[PDB]
PDB file of C-alpha atoms and ligand atoms in Angstrom:
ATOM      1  CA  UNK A   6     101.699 -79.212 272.157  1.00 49.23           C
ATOM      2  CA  UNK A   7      98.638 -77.661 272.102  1.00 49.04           C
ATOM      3  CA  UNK A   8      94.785 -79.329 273.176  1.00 50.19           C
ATOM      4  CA  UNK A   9      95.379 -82.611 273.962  1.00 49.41           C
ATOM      5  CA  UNK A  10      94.693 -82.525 278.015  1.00 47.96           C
ATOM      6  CA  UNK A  11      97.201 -84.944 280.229  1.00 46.13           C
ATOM      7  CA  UNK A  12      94.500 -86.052 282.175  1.00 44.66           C
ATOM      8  CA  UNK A  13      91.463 -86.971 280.071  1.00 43.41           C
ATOM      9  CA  UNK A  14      88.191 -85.136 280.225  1.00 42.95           C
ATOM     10  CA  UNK A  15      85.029 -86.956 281.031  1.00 46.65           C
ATOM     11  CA  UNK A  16      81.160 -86.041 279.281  1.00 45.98           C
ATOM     12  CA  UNK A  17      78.551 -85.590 281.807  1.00 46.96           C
ATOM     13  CA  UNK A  18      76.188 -87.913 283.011  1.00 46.09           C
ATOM     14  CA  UNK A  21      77.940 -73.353 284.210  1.00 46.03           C
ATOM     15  CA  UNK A  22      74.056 -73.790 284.913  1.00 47.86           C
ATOM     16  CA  UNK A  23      73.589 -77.447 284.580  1.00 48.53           C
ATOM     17  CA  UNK A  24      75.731 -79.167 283.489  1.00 48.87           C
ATOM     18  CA  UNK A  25      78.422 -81.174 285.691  1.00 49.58           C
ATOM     19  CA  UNK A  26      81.604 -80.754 287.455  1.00 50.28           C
ATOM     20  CA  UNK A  27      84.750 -81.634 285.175  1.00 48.51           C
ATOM     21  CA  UNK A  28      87.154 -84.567 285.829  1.00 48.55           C
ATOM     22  CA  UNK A  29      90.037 -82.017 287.439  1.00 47.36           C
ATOM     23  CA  UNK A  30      92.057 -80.958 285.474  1.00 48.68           C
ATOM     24  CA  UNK A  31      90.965 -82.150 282.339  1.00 48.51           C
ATOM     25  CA  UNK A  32      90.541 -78.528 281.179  1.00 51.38           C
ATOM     26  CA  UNK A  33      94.010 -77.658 281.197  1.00 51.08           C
ATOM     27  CA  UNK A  34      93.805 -74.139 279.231  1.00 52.10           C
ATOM     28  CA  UNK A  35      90.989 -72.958 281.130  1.00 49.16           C
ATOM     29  CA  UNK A  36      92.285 -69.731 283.439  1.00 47.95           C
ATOM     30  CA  UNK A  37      90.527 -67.970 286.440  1.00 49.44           C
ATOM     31  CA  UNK A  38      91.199 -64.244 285.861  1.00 46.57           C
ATOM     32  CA  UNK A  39      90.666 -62.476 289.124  1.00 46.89           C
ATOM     33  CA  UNK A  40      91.361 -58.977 289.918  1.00 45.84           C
ATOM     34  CA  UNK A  43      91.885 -62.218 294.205  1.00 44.96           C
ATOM     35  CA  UNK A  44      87.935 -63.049 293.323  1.00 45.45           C
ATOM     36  CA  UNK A  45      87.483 -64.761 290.273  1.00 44.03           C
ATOM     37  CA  UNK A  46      85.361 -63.050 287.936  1.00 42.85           C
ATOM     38  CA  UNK A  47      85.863 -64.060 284.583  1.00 42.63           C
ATOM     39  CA  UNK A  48      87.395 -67.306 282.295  1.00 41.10           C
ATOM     40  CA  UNK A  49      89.917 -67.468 280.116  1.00 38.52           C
ATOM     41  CA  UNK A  50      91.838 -69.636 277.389  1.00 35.79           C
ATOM     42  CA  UNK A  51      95.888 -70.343 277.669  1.00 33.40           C
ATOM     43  CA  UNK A  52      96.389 -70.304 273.891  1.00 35.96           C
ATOM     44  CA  UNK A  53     100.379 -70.116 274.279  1.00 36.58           C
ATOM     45  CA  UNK A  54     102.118 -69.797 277.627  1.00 34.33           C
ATOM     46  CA  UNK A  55     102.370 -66.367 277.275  1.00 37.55           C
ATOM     47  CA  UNK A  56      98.874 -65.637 276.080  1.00 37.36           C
ATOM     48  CA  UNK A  57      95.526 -65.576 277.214  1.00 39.82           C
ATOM     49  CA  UNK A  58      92.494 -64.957 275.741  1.00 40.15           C
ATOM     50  CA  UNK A  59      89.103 -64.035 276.963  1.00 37.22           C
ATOM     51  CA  UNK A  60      86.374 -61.864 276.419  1.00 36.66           C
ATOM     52  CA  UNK A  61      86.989 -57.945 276.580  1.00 39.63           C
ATOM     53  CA  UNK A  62      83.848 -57.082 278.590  1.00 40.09           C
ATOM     54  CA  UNK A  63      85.708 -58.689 281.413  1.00 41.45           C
ATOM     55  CA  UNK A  64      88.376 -55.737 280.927  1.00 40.38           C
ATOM     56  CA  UNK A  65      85.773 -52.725 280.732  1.00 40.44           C
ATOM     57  CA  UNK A  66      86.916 -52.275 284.184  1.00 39.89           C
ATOM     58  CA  UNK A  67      90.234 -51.541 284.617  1.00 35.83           C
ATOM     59  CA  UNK A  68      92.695 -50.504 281.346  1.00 34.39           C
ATOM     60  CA  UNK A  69      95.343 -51.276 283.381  1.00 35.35           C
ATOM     61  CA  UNK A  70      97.635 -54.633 283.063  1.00 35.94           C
ATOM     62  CA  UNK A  71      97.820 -54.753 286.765  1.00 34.15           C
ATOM     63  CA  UNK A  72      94.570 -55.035 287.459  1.00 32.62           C
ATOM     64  CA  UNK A  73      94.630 -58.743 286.472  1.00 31.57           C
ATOM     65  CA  UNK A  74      96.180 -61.599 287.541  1.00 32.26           C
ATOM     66  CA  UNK A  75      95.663 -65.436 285.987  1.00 33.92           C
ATOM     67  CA  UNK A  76      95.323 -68.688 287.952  1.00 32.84           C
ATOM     68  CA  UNK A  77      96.298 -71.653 285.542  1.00 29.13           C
ATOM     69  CA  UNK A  78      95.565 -75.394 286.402  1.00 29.82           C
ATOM     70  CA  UNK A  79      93.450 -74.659 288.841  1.00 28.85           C
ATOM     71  CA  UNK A  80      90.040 -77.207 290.117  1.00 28.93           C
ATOM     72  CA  UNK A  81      88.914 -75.403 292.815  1.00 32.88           C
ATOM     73  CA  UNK A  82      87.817 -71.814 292.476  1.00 33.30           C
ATOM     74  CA  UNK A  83      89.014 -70.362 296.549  1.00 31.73           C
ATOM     75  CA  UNK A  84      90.741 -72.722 297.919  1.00 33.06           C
ATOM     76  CA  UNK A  85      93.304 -72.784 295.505  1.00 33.01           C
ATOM     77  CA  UNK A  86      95.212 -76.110 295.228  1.00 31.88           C
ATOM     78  CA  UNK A  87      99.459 -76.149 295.849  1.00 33.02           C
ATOM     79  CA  UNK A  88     100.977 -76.702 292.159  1.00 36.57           C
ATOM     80  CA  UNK A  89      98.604 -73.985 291.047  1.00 37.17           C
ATOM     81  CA  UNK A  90      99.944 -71.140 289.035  1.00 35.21           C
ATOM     82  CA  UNK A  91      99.429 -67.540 289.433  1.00 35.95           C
ATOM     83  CA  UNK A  92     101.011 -65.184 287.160  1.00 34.32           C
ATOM     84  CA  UNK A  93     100.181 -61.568 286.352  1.00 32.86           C
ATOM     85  CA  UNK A  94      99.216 -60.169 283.504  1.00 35.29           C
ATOM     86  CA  UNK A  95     101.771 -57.470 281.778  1.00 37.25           C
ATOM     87  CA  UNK A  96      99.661 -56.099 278.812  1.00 36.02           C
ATOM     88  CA  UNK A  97      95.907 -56.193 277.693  1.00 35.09           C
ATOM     89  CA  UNK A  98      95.011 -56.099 273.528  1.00 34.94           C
ATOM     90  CA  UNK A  99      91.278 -55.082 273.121  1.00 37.44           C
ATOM     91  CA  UNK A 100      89.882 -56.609 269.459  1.00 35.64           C
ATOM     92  CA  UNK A 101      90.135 -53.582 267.115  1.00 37.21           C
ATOM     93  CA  UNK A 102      87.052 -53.568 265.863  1.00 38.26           C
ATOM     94  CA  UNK A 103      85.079 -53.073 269.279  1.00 41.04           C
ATOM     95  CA  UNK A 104      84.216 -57.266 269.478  1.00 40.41           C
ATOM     96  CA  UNK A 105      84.118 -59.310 272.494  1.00 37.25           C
ATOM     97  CA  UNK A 106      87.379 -60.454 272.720  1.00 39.41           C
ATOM     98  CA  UNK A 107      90.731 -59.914 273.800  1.00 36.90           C
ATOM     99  CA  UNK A 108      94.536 -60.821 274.549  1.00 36.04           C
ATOM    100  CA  UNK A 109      96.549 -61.006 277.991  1.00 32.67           C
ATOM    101  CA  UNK A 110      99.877 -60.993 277.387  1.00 29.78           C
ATOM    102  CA  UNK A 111     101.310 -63.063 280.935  1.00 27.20           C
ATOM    103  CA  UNK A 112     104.495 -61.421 282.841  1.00 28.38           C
ATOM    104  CA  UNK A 113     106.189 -64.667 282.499  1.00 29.40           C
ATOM    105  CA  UNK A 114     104.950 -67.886 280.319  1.00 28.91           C
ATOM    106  CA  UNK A 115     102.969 -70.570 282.078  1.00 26.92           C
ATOM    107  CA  UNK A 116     105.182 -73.646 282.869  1.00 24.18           C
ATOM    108  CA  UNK A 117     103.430 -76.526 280.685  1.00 24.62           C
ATOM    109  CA  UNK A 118     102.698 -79.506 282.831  1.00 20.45           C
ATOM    110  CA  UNK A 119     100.143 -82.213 282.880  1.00 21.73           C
ATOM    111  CA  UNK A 120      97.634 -79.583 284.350  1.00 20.62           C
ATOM    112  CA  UNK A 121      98.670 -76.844 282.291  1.00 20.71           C
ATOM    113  CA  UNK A 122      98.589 -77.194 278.503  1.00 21.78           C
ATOM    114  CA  UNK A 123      97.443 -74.663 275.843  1.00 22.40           C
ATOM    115  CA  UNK A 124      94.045 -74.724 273.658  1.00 19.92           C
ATOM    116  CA  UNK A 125      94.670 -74.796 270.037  1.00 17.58           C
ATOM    117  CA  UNK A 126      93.340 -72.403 267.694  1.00 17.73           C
ATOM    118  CA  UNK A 127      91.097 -73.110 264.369  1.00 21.30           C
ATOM    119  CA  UNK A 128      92.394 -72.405 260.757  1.00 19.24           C
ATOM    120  CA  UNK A 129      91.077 -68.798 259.670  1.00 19.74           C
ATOM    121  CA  UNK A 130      87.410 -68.362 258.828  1.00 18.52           C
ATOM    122  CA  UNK A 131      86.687 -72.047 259.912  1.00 19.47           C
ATOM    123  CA  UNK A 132      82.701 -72.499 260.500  1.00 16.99           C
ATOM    124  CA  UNK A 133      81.669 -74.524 263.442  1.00 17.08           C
ATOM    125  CA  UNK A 134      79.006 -77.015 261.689  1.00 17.54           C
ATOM    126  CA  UNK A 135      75.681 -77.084 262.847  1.00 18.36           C
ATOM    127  CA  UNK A 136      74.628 -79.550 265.801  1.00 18.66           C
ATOM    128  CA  UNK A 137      78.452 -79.991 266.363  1.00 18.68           C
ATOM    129  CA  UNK A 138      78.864 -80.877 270.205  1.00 18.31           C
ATOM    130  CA  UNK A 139      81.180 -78.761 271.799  1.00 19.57           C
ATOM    131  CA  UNK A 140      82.628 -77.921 275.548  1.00 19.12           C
ATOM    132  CA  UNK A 141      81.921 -75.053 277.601  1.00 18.72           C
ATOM    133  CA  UNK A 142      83.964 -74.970 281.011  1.00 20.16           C
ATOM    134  CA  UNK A 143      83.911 -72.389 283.969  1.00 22.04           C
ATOM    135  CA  UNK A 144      83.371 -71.353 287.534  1.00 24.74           C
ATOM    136  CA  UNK A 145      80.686 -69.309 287.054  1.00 23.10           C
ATOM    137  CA  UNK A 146      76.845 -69.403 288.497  1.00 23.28           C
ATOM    138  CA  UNK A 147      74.712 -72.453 288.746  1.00 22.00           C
ATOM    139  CA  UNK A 148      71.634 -71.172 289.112  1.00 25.82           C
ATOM    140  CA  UNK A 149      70.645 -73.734 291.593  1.00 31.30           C
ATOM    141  CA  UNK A 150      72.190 -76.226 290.089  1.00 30.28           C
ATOM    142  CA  UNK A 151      75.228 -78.003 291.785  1.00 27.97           C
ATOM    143  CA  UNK A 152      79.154 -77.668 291.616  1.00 27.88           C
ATOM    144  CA  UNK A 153      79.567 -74.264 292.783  1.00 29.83           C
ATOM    145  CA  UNK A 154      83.186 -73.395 294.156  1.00 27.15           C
ATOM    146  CA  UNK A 155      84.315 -76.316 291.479  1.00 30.15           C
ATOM    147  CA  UNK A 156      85.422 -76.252 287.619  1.00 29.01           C
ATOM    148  CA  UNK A 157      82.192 -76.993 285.642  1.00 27.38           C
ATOM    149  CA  UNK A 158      81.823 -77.927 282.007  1.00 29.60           C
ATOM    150  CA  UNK A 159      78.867 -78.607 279.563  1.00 29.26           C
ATOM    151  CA  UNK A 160      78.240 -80.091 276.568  1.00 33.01           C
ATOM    152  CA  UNK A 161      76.455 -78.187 273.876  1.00 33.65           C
ATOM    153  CA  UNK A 162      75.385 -78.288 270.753  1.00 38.42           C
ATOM    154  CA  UNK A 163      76.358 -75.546 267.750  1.00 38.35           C
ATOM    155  CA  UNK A 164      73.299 -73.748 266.322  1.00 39.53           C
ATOM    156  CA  UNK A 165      74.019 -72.823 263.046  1.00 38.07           C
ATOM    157  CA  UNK A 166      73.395 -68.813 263.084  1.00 38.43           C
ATOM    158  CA  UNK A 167      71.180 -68.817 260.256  1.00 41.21           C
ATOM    159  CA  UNK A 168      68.931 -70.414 262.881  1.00 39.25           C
ATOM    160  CA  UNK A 169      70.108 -68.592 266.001  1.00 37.63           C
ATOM    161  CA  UNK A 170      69.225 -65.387 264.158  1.00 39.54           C
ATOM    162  CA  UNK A 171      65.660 -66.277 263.794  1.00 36.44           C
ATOM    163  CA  UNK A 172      62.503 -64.730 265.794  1.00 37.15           C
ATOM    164  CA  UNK A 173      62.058 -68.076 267.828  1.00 35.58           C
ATOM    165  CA  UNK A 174      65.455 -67.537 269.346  1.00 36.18           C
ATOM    166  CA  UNK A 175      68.112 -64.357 269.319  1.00 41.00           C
ATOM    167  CA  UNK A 176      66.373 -62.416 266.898  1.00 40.37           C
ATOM    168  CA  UNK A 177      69.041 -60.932 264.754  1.00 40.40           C
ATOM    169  CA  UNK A 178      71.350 -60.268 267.236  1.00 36.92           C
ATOM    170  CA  UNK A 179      73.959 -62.896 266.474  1.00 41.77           C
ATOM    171  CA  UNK A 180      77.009 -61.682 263.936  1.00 41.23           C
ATOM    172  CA  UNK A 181      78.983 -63.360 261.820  1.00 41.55           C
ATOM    173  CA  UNK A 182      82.198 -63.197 264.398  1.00 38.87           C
ATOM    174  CA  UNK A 183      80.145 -64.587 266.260  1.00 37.52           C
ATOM    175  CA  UNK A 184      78.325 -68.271 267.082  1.00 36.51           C
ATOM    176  CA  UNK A 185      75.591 -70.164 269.090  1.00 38.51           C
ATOM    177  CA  UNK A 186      75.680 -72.992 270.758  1.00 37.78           C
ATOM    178  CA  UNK A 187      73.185 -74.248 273.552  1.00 39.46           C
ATOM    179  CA  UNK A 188      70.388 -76.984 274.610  1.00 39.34           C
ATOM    180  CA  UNK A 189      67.155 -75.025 273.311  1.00 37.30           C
ATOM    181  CA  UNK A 190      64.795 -76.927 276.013  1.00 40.64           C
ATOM    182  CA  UNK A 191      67.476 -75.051 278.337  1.00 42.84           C
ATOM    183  CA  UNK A 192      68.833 -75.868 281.871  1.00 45.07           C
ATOM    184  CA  UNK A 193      72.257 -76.172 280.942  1.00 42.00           C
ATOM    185  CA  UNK A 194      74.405 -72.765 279.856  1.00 43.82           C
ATOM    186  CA  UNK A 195      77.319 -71.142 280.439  1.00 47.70           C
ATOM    187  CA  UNK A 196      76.633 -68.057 282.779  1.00 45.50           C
ATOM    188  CA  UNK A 197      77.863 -65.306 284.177  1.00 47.69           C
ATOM    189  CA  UNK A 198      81.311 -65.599 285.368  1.00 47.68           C
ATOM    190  CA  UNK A 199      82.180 -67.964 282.229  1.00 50.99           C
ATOM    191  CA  UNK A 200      82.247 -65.469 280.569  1.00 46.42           C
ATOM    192  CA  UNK A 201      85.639 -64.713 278.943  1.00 47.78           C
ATOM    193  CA  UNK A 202      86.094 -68.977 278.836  1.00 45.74           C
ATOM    194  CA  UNK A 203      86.269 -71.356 276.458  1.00 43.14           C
ATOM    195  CA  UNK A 204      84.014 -73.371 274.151  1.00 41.93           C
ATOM    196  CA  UNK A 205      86.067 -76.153 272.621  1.00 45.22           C
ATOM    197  CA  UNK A 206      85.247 -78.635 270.290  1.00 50.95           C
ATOM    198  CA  UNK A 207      86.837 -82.097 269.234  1.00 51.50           C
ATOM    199  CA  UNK A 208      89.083 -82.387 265.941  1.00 53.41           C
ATOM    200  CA  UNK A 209      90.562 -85.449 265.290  1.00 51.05           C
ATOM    201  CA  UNK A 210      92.493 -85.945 268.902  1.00 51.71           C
ATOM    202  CA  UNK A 211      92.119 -83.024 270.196  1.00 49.93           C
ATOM    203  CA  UNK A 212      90.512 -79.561 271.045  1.00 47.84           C
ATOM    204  CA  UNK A 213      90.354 -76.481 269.112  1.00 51.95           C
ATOM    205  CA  UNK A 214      89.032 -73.035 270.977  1.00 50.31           C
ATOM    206  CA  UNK A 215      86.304 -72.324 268.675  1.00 47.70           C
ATOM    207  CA  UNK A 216      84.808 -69.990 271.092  1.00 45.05           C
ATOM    208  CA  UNK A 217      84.837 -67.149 273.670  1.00 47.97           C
ATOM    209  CA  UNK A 218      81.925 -66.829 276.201  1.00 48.52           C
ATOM    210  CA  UNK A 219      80.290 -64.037 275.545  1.00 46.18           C
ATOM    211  CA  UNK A 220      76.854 -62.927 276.576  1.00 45.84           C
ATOM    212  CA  UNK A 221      73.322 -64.495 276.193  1.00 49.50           C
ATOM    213  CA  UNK A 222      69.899 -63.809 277.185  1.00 48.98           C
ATOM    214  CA  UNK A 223      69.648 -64.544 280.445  1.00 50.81           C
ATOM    215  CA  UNK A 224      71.231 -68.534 281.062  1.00 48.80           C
ATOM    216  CA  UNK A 225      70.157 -71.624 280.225  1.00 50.69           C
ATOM    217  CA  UNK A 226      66.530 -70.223 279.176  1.00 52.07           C
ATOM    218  CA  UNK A 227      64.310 -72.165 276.274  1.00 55.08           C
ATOM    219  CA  UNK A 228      64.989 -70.836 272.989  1.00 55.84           C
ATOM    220  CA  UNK A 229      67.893 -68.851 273.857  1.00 54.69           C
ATOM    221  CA  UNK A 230      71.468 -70.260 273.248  1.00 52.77           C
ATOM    222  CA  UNK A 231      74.370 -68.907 274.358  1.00 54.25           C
ATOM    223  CA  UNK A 232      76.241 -66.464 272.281  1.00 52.02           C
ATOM    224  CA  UNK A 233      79.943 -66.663 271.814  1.00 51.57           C
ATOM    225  CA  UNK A 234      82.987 -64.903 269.900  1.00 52.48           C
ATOM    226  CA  UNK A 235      83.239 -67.058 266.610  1.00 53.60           C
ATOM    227  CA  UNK A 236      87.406 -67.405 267.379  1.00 56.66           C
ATOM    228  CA  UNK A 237      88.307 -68.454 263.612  1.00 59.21           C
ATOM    229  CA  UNK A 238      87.110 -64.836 262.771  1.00 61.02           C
ATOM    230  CA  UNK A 239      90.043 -63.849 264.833  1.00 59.36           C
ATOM    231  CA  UNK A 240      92.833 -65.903 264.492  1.00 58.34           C
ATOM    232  CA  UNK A 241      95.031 -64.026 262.057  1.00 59.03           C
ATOM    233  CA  UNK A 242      94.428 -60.881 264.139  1.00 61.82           C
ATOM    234  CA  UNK A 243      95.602 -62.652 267.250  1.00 64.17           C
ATOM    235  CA  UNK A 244      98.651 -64.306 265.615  1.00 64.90           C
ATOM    236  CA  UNK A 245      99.494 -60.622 264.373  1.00 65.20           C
ATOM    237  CA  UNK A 246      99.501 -59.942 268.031  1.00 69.85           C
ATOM    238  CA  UNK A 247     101.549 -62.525 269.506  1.00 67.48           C
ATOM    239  CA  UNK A 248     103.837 -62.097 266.527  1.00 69.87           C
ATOM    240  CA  UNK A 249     104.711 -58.660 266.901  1.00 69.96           C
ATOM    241  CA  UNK A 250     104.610 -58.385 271.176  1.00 63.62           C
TER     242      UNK A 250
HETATM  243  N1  LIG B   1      75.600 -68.539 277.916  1.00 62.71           N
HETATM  244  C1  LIG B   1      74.884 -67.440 278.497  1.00 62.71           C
HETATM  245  C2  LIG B   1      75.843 -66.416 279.080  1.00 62.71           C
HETATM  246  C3  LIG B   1      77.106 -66.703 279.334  1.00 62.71           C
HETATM  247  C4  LIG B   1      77.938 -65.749 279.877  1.00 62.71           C
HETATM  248  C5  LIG B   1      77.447 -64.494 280.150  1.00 62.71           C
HETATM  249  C6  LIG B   1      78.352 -63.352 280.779  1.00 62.71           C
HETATM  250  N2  LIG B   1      78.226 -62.254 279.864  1.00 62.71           N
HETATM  251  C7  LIG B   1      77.432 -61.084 280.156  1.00 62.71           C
HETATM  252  O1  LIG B   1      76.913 -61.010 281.125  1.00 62.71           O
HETATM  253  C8  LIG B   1      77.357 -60.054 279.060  1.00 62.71           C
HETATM  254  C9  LIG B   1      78.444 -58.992 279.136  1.00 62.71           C
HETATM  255  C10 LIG B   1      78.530 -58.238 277.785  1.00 62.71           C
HETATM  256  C11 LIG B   1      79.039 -58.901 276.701  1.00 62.71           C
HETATM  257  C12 LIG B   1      79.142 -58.287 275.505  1.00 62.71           C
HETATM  258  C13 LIG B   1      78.775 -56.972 275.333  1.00 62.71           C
HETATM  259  C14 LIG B   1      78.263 -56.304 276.413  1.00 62.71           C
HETATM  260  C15 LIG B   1      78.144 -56.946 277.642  1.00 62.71           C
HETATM  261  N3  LIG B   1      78.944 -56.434 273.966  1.00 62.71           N
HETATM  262  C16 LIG B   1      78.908 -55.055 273.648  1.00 62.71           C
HETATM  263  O2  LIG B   1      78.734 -54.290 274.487  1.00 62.71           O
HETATM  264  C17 LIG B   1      79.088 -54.668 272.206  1.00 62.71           C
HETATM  265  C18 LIG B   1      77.976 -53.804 271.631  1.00 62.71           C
HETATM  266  N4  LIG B   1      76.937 -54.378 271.152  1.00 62.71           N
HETATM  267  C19 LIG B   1      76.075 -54.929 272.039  1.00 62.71           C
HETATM  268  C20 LIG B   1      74.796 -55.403 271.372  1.00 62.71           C
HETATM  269  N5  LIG B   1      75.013 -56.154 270.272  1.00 62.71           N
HETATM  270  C21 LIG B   1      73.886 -56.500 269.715  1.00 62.71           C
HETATM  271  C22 LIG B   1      73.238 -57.867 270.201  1.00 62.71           C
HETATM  272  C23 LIG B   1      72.870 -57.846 271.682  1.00 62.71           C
HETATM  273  O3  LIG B   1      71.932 -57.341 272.080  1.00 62.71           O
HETATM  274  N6  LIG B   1      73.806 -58.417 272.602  1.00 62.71           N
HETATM  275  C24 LIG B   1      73.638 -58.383 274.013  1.00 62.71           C
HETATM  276  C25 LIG B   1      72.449 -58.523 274.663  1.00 62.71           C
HETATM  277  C26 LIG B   1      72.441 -58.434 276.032  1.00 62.71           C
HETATM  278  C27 LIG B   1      73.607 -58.227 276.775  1.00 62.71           C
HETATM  279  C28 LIG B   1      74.803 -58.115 276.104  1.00 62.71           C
HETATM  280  C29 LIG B   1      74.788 -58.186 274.736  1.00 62.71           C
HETATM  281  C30 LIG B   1      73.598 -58.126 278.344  1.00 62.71           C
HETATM  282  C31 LIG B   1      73.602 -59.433 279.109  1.00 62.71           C
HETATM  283  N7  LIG B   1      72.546 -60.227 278.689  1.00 62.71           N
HETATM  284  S1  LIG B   1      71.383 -60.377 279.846  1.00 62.71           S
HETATM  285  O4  LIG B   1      70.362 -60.919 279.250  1.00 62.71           O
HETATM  286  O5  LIG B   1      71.061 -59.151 280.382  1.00 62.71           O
HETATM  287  C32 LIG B   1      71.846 -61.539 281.082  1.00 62.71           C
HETATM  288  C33 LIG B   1      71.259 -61.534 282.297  1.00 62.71           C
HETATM  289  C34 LIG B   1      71.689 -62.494 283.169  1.00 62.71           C
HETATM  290  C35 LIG B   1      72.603 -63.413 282.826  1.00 62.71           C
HETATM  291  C36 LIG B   1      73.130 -63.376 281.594  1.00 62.71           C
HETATM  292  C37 LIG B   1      72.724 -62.443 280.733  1.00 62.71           C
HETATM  293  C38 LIG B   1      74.909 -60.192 278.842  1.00 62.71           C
HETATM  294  O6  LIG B   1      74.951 -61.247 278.428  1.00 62.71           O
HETATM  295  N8  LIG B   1      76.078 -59.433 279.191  1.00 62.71           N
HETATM  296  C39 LIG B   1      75.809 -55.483 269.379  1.00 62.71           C
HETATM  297  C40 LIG B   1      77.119 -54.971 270.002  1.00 62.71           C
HETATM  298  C41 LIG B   1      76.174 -64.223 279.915  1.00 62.71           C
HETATM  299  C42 LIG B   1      75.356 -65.187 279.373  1.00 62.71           C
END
């Protein structure tokens, strides 16, 4: 099955934000290199996808390692799962995103379920309050060490592209989403993780952290892959390694 956590996730009551109800976040994956540095998405339990900045470093499969069903960031708890990674798929056409192919699948347990994807070419709507989970900065705000989500809203890129916020910056394959007063934003260290949002019963990866500027700033929402633009691309993938 794919997006419907075990244990149910809770809304608030990352920069901001609060710390999720553990393990309610089941596809969300620490990549490390053993530090965590980037997020990640399960989307199958032998595929991972994040964002392929978080690769410039090292071509090289062994490089990376992924921690699945994970709360805490060091200490990492017993039934957690680490499994290297034996192949890295950069997006074609230079975008911010790409696919880990896993050395073994993930074993699918109550803390360890896969994200679904969105049909092809599938437009987040405006306003549309999504998730954003990770263990990256706080920027003085609380639950470091801890997995973090926050809820944001979509901003339609037709907005996000004007003056009074990105500018023109913000492709198609791409979308916004973010709390324009600001205080709450993924950061650094999310990047490469999830934005989900709620379909019917359960939760579709509609995005991949990507890059922003600065976190959690007035008038500047968080930019992230638009994942819809690359679902038949990624299903090629999986379908043919
Ligand atoms: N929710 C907020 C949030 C969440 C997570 C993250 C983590 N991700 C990064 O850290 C991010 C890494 C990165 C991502 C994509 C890249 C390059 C680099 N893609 C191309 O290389 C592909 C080639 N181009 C690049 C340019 N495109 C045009 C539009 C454009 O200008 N895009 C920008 C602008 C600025 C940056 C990156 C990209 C650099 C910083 N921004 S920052 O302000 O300095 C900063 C300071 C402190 C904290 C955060 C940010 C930034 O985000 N880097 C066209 C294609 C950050 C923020």
């Amino acid at each position: 099955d794919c997006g419907k956590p075990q244990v149910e996730p809770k809304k608030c009551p990352v920069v901001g934000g609060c710390v999720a109800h553990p393990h309610s976040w089941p596809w969300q994956v620490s990549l490390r290199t053993g530090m965590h540095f980037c997020g990640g998405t399960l989307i199958s339990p032998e595929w991972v996808l994040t964002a392929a900045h978080c690769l410039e470093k090292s071509p090289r499969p062994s490089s990376y390692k992924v921690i699945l069903g994970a709360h805490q960031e060091v200490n990492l708890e017993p039934h957690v799962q680490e499994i290297e990674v034996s192949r890295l798929f950069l997006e074609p056409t230079r975008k911010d995103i790409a696919l880990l192919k896993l050395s073994s699948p993930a074993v699918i347990t109550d803390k360890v379920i896969p994200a679904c994807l969105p049909s092809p070419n599938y437009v987040v709507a405006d306003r549309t309050e999504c998730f954003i989970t990770g263990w990256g900065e706080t920027q003085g705000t609380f639950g470091a060490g801890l997995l973090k989500e926050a809820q944001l809203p979509v901003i339609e890129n037709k907005v996000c592209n004007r003056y009074e916020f990105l500018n023109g910056r913000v492709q198609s394959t791409e979308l916004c989403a973010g709390h324009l007063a600001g205080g709450t934003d993924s950061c650094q260290g999310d990047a490469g993780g999830p934005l989900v949002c709620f379909e019917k019963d359960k939760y579709i990866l509609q995005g991949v952290t990507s890059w922003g500027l600065g976190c959690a700033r007035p008038n500047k929402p968080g930019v992230y892959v638009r994942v819809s633009r690359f679902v038949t691309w990624i299903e090629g993938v999986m379908r043919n390694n």
